[model samples]
Every structure is written in C-alpha cells, then in structure tokens.
Target: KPVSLSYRCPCRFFESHVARANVKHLKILNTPNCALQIVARLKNNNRQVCIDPKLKWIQEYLEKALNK
Candidate 1:
C-alpha cells in the first residue's frame, strides 16, 4: 500500500482552494507515478493532443514547480 498524507483545513474556502493547490504542488514536487504514464501513452499512441485537458493542469503545475 502506498503511504500518503492527508490535510484537513478548518476553513472551508481555504480548504477548497488550498487542497487543490497543494495537490498540484505535490504532484509536481513528488514527480508523481502517473507522469511517465502520461508520456508513455502519448508516445506509444501518437495521441499527444488527444490527451484529456486535465493533463494540461499537470503540465502547468510542473512548469510552476520548475520555476520555483
């Protein structure tokens, strides 16, 4: 089983926004297991552009992480 961290914020609005932001940060900083999955699928299928828009979120977050 994979070990994970869970955060529970007391403020609702902060919780909503911060949860998303933190998850994105973690995805980039942790070099998530799925990153290679994305690249592999994109390469093997020649369907890079066909990837779901949600992947753009990961790309953007990675760019931000690299800049930091």
Candidate 2:
C-alpha cells in the first residue's frame, strides 16, 4: 500500500487567480489513479495545487509550456 501523499490528487482545488511568479510549473495528469486533471506545482512551498483547466489563463499557460 502507498501513503496518502503518493495519491497526488486533491479533493478540492485552491484559488482561481494564481500568480505565475509563485508557480514552479504545471502537471497535466490524465491517469487512472486520479480524477483531477491539471495540477500546479508551486515554488514557495513545493505543493501540488489543483487548478481548473477550463480557465483561459490555464489554457494559455499549457500552450506555452507544452510547446516548449
């Protein structure tokens, strides 16, 4: 059995407007283990905060990140 931290899936998300400066990167997970889609990795605390993918900013961010 794995620990709860290994799940890496959040029951609820964080905020709507997240500053880019505070974010380290993003994780787009479409795996069998988790239902949540996009997770943002923060620089300050190194925590995975689940973010809404449907947001305009998120789509734009993914476009840049994925293209690179």
Candidate 3:
C-alpha cells in the first residue's frame, strides 16, 4: 500500500506542487497520528508544503538524504 494502515491523521497541504529549488528543508512526518507523510519547507515562504512520497523527485531526494 502507498500509505501505511497505522496512520490516521491526514494533513492538508498548503502547496503540493512545489519547485525543488525553492525548498529550504524537508521534514518527514510519518508519525502515528499525523499522516500527511512528507513535508517540505519553502525557501521563499516559511510555510509547510506537503510532498507526495510517491513523487520521483522526492524519492530521489530522500534516497540521498536518508542514505539508504
């Protein structure tokens, strides 16, 4: 399954389609309750932008960042 069955909370993303260059930092929110999954902080705007875990770019970014 794309999403885990354990997670229940769903977060509403302010922005889902964000440019990689504009991202300042990434935060993985795979917590038990909060399930928006991946979140990225925009450089230009200090707002939490939700990212899709299935995205190719995000997967590559996480691969290097997570070092797995």
lDDT: which is higher, 1 or 3? 3
Off by over 4 Å in 2: 1-14, 31-36, 65-68
Overall lDDT per candidate, in order of appearance = 0.31, 0.70, 0.72
Residue pairs in clash, model 3: none
Kindly report which residue pairs in candidate 2 clash with one another: none
- Estimate the lDDT of model 1: 0.31
How well does each candidate superpose onto the true structure, as a TM-score? Answer: 0.26, 0.55, 0.62
For model 3, residues 1-68, the per-residue Cα lDDT tens digits are: 66656545555443556677888998877756554477788887877777877777787888898796
Better of 2 and 3 by lDDT: 3
- Superposition TM-score, candidate 2 onto the true structure: 0.55
Model 3 misplaced stretches (Cα beyond 4 Å) = 1-10, 32-36
lDDT string, candidate 2, 1-68, tens digits: 44466555553454577767777987766646556477788998887777777667887887887799
Better of 1 and 2 by TM-score: 2
Show the lowest summed lDDT stretch of 10 residues, model 2: 6-15
**Candidate 1 per-residue C-alpha lDDT over 1-68 given as tens digits, one digit per residue, 9 for 90 to 100:** 33334423211111111222324223111124323222212333332222222455566755776698
Weakest ten-residue segment in model 3 by summed lDDT: 7-16
